[PDB]
Write a protein that binds this ligand. Structure first.
Ligand SMILES: Nc1ncnc2c1ncn2[C@@H]1O[C@H](COP(=O)(O)OP(=O)(O)O)[C@@H](O)[C@H]1O
Ligand SMILES: Nc1ncnc2c1ncn2[C@@H]1O[C@H](COP(=O)(O)OP(=O)(O)O)[C@@H](O)[C@H]1O
Ligand SMILES: [Mg+2]
Ligand SMILES: [Mg+2]
Lengths: 225, 50, 453, 587, 48, 200, 229, 200
């Protein structure tokens, strides 16, 4: 593997690594700080023997001369498995429910690929959310992008959790899952979901990715991916 | 009775036309200079980085 | 140690090479080939060179045959007991053709931050002679009360009127008035100096004058000189000092100029990003101190660009100063002198200088009565011109008759008419006497019949 | 330590070479004087430093010494009943040594008293293995507070050498034997201010905080670990509110943080606070309070690092198992400093010139407050309840600071100037104000009191909300239409306005109100308008009852001043109102 | 519902003042309307 | 760009005769005063300055036309020799001095035109004559400085204008007004500034 | 290329040239393209700081010169962006040129041809331009009267459509009626109709005839009687 | 990027039959004319353009999916082959050419989609056919130009868009119109450009 001890400069959250080779755009890195602490980062741009990277946790407390940068040779991935059902993860797919670790079937770029417009199939199937205003007048369709426009104080939390547990598909499909994604929400807002999911048994049907307000901003934008 | 209608017209015309046209205008005016201010601030950073 | 190593000249900025031991903001002077001598200041210094900005401009300089000298000290001020009575410039040099003073010691005009636990809060009432200021928005020692004006609102007459009439009461301590002038037209400068001479206030005040054509780099130093002089009179001489600065809008315009010189990018509205802090550095230096009998009080004057408070100059000032005195165009164009509007005006520490021991025992009680009655009278006036005179209840009509009588006889005293506190208080009663005894619900049974005509 | 050398000085920016052993965000002493500074950037061995005091007189060649650590604080005995700045500099100790009433440049001095001797009492027994947070002994700094000395983070093992005696903070009062080696532990630990102290688990703030102020605890309660934003315009008496909160609230300690406030507002905080008295002990509140004070002309970093210093100290006593309440004022002045530091770094600005990370920076702060399970086998729990004040530009709550605050807090106490001259104390707008803990608190106060308290509160707010709409429509056609059925709810709401929402905090009884008192009080006014609604539906016009109920309206607000023990009168008020309308219902 | 674009800054605050005058005027004309109506209904009953 | 030395400087007391009822009555300018005429295009800024130049009670006038139309200047030289008005019994050209700088003339020459017209004014001021200088338009001077500031890639101030605009303008107006010349003959001379500002 | 060919035919060859340029807006767009390419310090809306000068070097290239019979007269056309008069391009042009002719959508939608809003428009050479010898002597007094009348009439019409026609005074309705008739016949004449200066003046009095003499304080009383209908 | 050559342009004087009452009657578009459809989301920009693709009296229709929804293109390749006009016996898909660069597809290729479709439209225009091209949406094209502009460190420009935005647009619509195709036949063809603008 590649381990480089040479960091040209550190400015804000951005770091510059010199004498580098075989590094790619959006490639993932790991910073081995002098105190043994390991921080993750991402390549923003690379030119010649130099690569500009951004550290997730931040560059605070790093001694350049005694820190090293390792390039993992792969972009930001996700370990996927069928055992992800019922589990709770953070913004980066790291477990959070303190359960057993998961051995991934494989790893996938969180960017994914674009569906061929030809290969696309028009939605054309009904989903029962339980809420009458939706299921009748503003029907949700399998494969549809149907958003909820809310406001501060408004019960969009209560509405989301409701749909999360109530929503099922008719025709008795034994396979229907819910992927719930939280982005930059407070602690109590996160606890509201995780508590309601467990007590209604909706957790057994759902995969949860929970990201908080105090969490790194990059983690917040990688959470939905 | 005639003057009531005149005054009623003025109140109605003032409340429905005049005031909302004022409020919505100062908002669109506020948004303009809000954008213009920072549209220049970015340019200035370019001047700074010459 | 004169260096003949001038490498660059861009704008007012100048570059000197091959130097050492040079400090930031260190004062310099450049000897030209013709012999002309100009001063400067280190705006930036690197390992083997330094950038300097010349006060007197950069016109007609030969880089090869000119030399620069480093004086090894920042902008300092000559402190002396024999300072009162004389007129100085922005840098401290005499302008009055008097005997050049021998200073006790030189001090950095930046000063130091006063310990929060050291601060002692002010109680003493200060009389300015102006009714609108001495009764409704009362000035207390060590307070920081600004004045908001506009281009052409008589803020220069009021400025003169204050220092002339400003006086401590009873207190056996002498009274110092450190006046500071910033980037003003000659006429305005000549106006103030003459006016302080004839009134004898010159022998009771210190003057720092700075014309408009004067270099911008010393326009910024002008207040720092005055404040340092004011701190030299209060904290090390035990005197109650009053500081007046004009213009403060001119201070910002000059503050902006040296920022573009440093090529610093402006933060908001074209003004630099340290405007609020830079203002606080020279504003928050006022007040009493524990153990010492000194006193520093500031009355900064600024012209709001096109009569707007939301402008960065008066807005940011509000977050620093306690209260504000606002002059109104509508008032001045109606012949009101001074054109002070008391409704938007405010003094956050007014009650500290009111009551028995400082003023008459009805001070606070009266103040709110005249104030509430004015607003009601103004509202009676606005409804009158829209619905006719008769639509008013005739006691709302007397509230209207009160509200214009209030401005014409109470607010309007004249720029040369002094009003002592007692003369102002019973004047309110004389106006409150118009109103019957039934509405005056802010005053109690001791005071209402002890003073009302 | 390695010494650096200044190679460039331009304003607040200072670059120095030979800083290879230094870290990013490290604190360092700059120049001959030794002014404090922060390492922002570093290329090769050349570190860029933001000097926080003025750099006049500083030039190239002068030394730069690194502290080896980022901005931290001293945590140990001698911290309570003290007043520092944003970076923990003892203002009274400052004055004593430097012999000045001012703050000079390059003046560094310890935060705690290292020469002072304390009596340590070892409660831990030699032989046991300790973990992070485990209490080893205690020192009664100032009762009410017992300063519980505990094991710092990053160390664990069996304790070998220990017993009580008189020591100072530098004296190794204990010895632990980790597998790394034998490290001794002093009774003081240092901790970075921009990093939260570790915990075992964060919990939900579900337990209401008893302030005694009716308007708060009933309609807008804040739980132990919650967060509340208060906008304080002048005249609203925000200072009166803060004092009452600091004194009456059932918290163990109080942390005050003054951020970049006026000079003529900060010494008020300084001098008026020892004047506060602690009810349970009858002694001054400062024996219970750590205070941070800064003014608008003090160094821009001290102003920015103010709330982080206080919250770190708050987290320290939080780990002891104590309930802490940190008060910040103003956070809007804090953000007006954070904005400036961004400008110096030439960062691309966000909304209204504020940094793009204003929300994150604010979120990082408030998320460090809350009910937690502190580290240690004892698994004790502590809490940090955050009260923060904002000062909007034009009373506008859509400004970035207030907006980002409400995004991460659940309680809003709006102080209205319009209610101030209406002599409404406290001046809290019951309409715009809200509390998301209200429902959870309702379930709590329902059970612990064993009454339908939540139903009473829900009824209280519903009546007041109707008063608003009634006032909008009563503005038209005057009192007409009389609407006695509506007009009744006004007299109830008018009552609800005076009896409960209004309370003079200087009146010996009207300044504090326990739960059972609040319950009995609101029960009167509720049952009044209920029995008043009874005679309304029975065909009796009601001004004829308004005259009969003159004898009870004299007691509904006398109940406000009714003493603690004498709730017997504050209970008979309620079945008395039954006979009054009944006697008037006979006519 | 936009009138015409007249972008100026002091014009904004003069517009806020114009707004408060309009509200003042609207307020005055509203309770003037009711007082004129007050006597109108009075006189109708005499009229009829 | 160097102010001609004086003994000392006086307060302008004597009102000028513009002939325009609006300004002579309600908004008067003294001999040696500083007047500004801000207004959009078509408001009559040039017309006013022409009307003041024609019927002023001063002894000499310096009409400085920088960055503005050429026809406006050819208009002046075609008519002023033909107009006659006291206090001079002769023509107006025997009283006026023109400094022409059209808008399509070189930009750097605009700042020159202003500083030359004021130096000629200071010259006759030192004699003891009352002189009035009309700067049309002063905004063109600023817009001229804005280009050179931009071309030098200098850090601009408000609206792109140089940060030293406020200081450079002050120098121009603090070089006018009623003063006494040098020597000991002590003749009084006044410079009245009628500046035309043309805000966007 | 056009203005050079104009000054060539007009001066060297003594011809009378009329210069038409459109769109003038697209010219300033081109300058900004090169300016943005050269990374130059941008003025308002990204346009070059030297826009006023460059535009002037075009418009000033017009007029007459001593001894030479020929003439070059210039009529540029620009589309105001955002329909905004304060935009850099129409602003700088207005400060350079000798007046401007302004079109309005309000008039154009009203079916007015040509839709020329006469109030914000201007000519800076109308003085020495018209009077006795070249026109009738009433030419100077008629336009100044029509201006003040339309200014009062149009504003009255505004008040009329919101507060009612019965809310105006009798003389207001006279101006309001005049203001409308002003637009429909005087301004609106069609794109293919040629009015001689005489017909226009004659029509001028006809339209302002419907007002009392006492209100017109801007026309010579001896001039009135002679030309008044 | 280079427009296909023609002999000369002609005035579009023949109105197009869209079958939409509001359009064909009150605001008609001629064959060779260009029409812009600015509107907020859900207003009907796409639906309108689909109607023109379905019923307009043209020989060919070239639909461009510029940075919009993928389902909106999938909806076309399915429904169009099932839409048969009664006379020909053949479907609508046998006269259309689809270009689809969706929103989540590479931004730079949005510009290519615009220029690819218009060139194909020119190819059949030269055959003497009447073609109609739909752009949905042109805003996403301009957004693509702004993206690459910032990467190239170019300077604005209005609202972040590059200074050459208007030119690119002007160049685009000028490629449409009634033309006389090259050749001895001097046959006539046309391109009618319908473009959806999506203002923020
Ligand atoms: N005082 C005035 N009296 C009569 N007409 C005037 C007056 N001022 C301006 N005008 C008219 O307005 C036009 C604009 O004149 P000018 O002074 O060039 O405007 P500006 O200087 O504001 O650009 C002139 O051609 C003239 O016809
Ligand atoms: N001409 C029309 N007839 C009927 N419904 C329409 C029409 N135009 C739009 N709609 C409705 O409006 C919605 C928006 O359609 P679309 O064209 O996708 O919006 P846009 O493209 O403007 O975002 C459609 O789902 C459709 O139901
Ligand atoms: Mg002009
Ligand atoms: Mg669409």
């Amino acid at each position: 593997i590649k381990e480089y001890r040479t960091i040209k400069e550190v400015v804000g959250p951005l770091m510059a690594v010199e004498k580098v080779s075989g590094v790619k755009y959006e490639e993932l890195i790991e910073v081995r700080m002098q105190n043994g602490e390991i921080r993750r980062g991402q390549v923003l741009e690379v030119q010649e023997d130099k690569a500009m990277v951004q550290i997730f946790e931040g560059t605070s407390g790093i001694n350049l001369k005694n820190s090293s940068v390792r390039f993992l040779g792969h972009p930001l991935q996700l370990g996927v498995s069928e055992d992800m059902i019922g589990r709770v993860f953070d913004g980066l797919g790291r477990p959070k429910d303190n359960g057993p670790e998961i051995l991934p079937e494989k790893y996938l770029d969180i960017n994914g690929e674009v569906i061929n417009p030809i290969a696309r199939d028009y939605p054309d199937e009904f989903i029962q959310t339980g809420i009458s205003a939706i299921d009748h007048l503003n029907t949700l369709v399998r494969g549809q992008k149907l958003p909820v426009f809310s406001g501060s104080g408004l019960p969009h939390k209560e509405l989301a959790a409701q749909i999360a547990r109530q929503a099922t598909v008719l025709d008795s499909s034994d396979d229907f899952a819910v992927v719930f994604a939280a982005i930059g929400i407070t602690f109590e807002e996160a606890e509201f979901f995780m508590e309601d999911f467990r007590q209604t048994g909706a957790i057994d049907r759902s995969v949860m990715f929970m990201n908080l307000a105090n969490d790194p901003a990059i983690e917040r934008i990688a959470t939905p991916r | 009775a005639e003057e009531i209608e005149k005054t009623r017209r003025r109140v109605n015309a003032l409340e429905y036309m005049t005031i909302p046209q004022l409020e919505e205008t100062i908002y669109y005016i506020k948004m303009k200079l809000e954008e213009n201010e920072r549209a220049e601030v970015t340019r200035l950073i370019k001047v700074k980085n010459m | 140690k004169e260096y003949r190593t001038i490498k660059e000249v861009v704008g007012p900025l100048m570059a000197v090479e091959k130097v050492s031991g040079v400090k930031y903001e260190e004062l310099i002077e450049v000897r030209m080939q013709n012999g002309e001598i100009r001063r400067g200041q280190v705006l930036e210094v690197q390992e083997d060179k330094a950038m300097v900005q010349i006060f007197e401009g950069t016109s007609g300089i030969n880089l090869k045959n000119s030399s620069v000298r480093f004086l090894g000290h920042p902008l300092q001020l000559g402190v002396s007991e024999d300072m009162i009575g004389r007129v100085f410039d922005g840098l401290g040099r005499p302008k009055d053709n008097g005997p050049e003073i021998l200073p006790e010691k030189y001090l950095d005009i930046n000063g130091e931050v006063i310990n929060p636990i050291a601060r002692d809060y002010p109680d003493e009432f200060i009389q300015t002679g102006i009714s609108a200021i001495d009764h409704l928005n009362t000035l207390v020692r060590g307070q920081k009360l600004p004045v908001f004006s506009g281009s052409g609102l008589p803020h220069k007459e009021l400025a003169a009127q204050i220092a002339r009439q400003a006086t401590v009461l009873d207190s056996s301590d002498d009274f110092a008035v450190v006046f500071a002038a910033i980037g003003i037209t000659f006429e305005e400068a000549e106006f103030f100096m003459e006016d302080f001479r004839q009134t004898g206030a010159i022998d009771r005040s210190v003057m720092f004058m700075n014309l408009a054509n004067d270099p911008a780099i010393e326009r910024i130093a002008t207040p720092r000189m005055a404040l340092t002089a004011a701190e030299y009179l209060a904290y090390e001489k035990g005197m109650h000092v009053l500081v007046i600065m004009t213009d403060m809008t001119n201070y910002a315009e000059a503050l902006r100029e040296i920022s573009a010189a440093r090529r610093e990018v402006p933060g908001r509205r074209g003004y630099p990003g340290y405007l609020y802090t830079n203002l606080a550095t020279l504003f928050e230096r006022a007040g009493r101190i524990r153990g010492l009998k000194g006193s520093v009080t500031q009355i900064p004057i600024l012209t709001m660009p096109e009569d707007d408070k939301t402008h960065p100059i008066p807005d940011l000032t509000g977050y620093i100063t306690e209260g504000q005195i606002i002059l109104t165009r509508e008032l001045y164009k109606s012949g009101i002198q001074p054109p002070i509007d008391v409704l938007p005006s405010l003094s956050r520490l007014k009650d500290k200088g009111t009551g028995a021991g400082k003023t008459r025992e009805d001070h606070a009680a009266t103040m709110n009565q005249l104030f509430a009655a004015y607003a009601q009278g103004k509202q009676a006036k606005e409804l009158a011109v829209v619905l006719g005179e008769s639509a008013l209840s005739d006691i709302d009509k007397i509230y209207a008759k009160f509200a214009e009588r209030f401005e014409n006889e109470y607010v309007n005293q004249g720029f040369y008419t002094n009003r002592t506190i007692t003369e102002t208080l019973d004047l309110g009663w004389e106006l409150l006497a118009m109103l019957p005894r039934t509405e005056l619900k802010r005053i109690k049974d001791d005071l209402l019949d002890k003073y009302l005509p | 330590m390695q010494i650096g050398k200044i190679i460039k000085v331009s304003g607040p920016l200072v670059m120095a070479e030979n800083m290879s052993e230094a870290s990013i965000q490290d604190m360092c002493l700059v120049g001959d004087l030794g002014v404090i500074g922060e390492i922002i950037e570093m290329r090769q061995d050349v570190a860029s430093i933001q000097v926080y005091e003025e750099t006049s007189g500083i030039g190239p060649g002068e030394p730069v010494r690194s502290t080896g650590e980022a901005l931290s604080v001293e945590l140990g005995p001698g911290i309570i009943s003290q007043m520092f700045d944003g970076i923990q500099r003892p203002l009274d100790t400052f004055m004593e040594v430097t012999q000045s009433n001012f703050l000079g440049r390059g003046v560094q001095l310890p935060a705690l008293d290292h020469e002072k001797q304390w009596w340590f009492e070892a409660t831990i027994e030699e032989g046991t293995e300790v973990s992070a947070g485990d209490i080893i002994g205690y020192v009664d700094e100032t009762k009410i507070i017992q300063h519980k000395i505990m094991v710092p983070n990053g160390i664990k093992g069996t304790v070998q050498k220990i017993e009580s005696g008189s020591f100072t903070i530098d004296d190794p009062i204990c010895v632990i034997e980790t597998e790394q080696g034998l490290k001794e532990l002093t009774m003081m630990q240092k901790w970075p201010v921009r990093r939260g102290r570790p915990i075992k688990q964060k919990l939900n703030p579900d337990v209401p905080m008893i302030t005694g102020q009716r308007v708060i605890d009933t309609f807008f309660p804040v739980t132990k670990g919650g967060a509340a934003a208060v906008p304080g315009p002048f005249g609203a008496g925000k200072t009166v509110v803060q004092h009452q909160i600091a004194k009456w609230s059932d918290v163990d300690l109080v942390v005050y943080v003054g951020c970049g406030e006026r000079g003529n507002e900060m010494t008020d905080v300084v001098n008026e606070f020892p004047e506060l008295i602690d009810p349970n002990t009858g002694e001054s509140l400062m024996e219970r309070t750590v205070l941070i004070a800064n003014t608008s002309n003090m160094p821009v970093a001290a102003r920015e690092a103010s709330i982080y210093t206080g919250i770190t100290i708050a987290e320290y006593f939080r780990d002891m198992g104590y309930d802490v309440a940190i008060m910040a004022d103003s956070t809007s002045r804090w953000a007006e400093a954070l904005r400036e530091m961004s400008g110096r770094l030439e960062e691309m600005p966000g909304d209204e010139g504020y940094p793009a990370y204003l929300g994150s920076r604010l979120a990082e702060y408030y998320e460090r407050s809350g009910r937690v399970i502190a580290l240690g086998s004892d698994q004790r729990e502590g809490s940090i309840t955050a009260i923060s004040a904002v000062s909007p530009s034009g009373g506008d709550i859509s400004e970035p600071v207030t907006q980002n605050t409400l995004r991460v807090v659940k309680v809003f106490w709006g102080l209205d100037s319009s209610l101030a001259q209406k002599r409404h104390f406290p001046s809290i707008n019951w309409i715009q104000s809200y509390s998301l803990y209200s429902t959870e608190v309702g379930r709590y106060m329902d059970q612990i009191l064993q009454q339908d308290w939540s139903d009473m509160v829900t009824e209280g707010m519903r009546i007041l909300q109707e008063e608003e709409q009634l006032n909008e429509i009563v503005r038209l056609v005057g009192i007409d239409s009389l609407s006695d059925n509506d007009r009744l709810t006004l007299e109830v709401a008018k009552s609800i306005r005076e009896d409960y929402l209004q309370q003079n905090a200087f009146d010996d009884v009207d300044t504090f109100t326990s739960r059972e008192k609040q319950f009995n009080m609101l029960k009167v006014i509720l049952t009044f308008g209920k029995e008043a609604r009874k005679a309304l539906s029975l065909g009796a016009y009601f001004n004829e009852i308004m005259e009969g109920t003159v004898a009870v309206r004299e007691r509904i607000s006398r109940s406000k001043y009714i003493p603690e023990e004498e709730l017997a009168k504050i209970s008979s008020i309620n079945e008395e109102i039954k006979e009054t309308i009944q006697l008037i219902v006979s006519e | 519902m936009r009138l015409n674009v007249n972008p100026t800054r002091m014009e904004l605050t003069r517009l806020k003042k114009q707004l408060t005058t309009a509200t003042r005027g609207h307020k005055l004309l509203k309770d003037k309307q009711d007082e004129l109506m007050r006597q109108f209904i009075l006189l109708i009953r005499k009229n009829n």
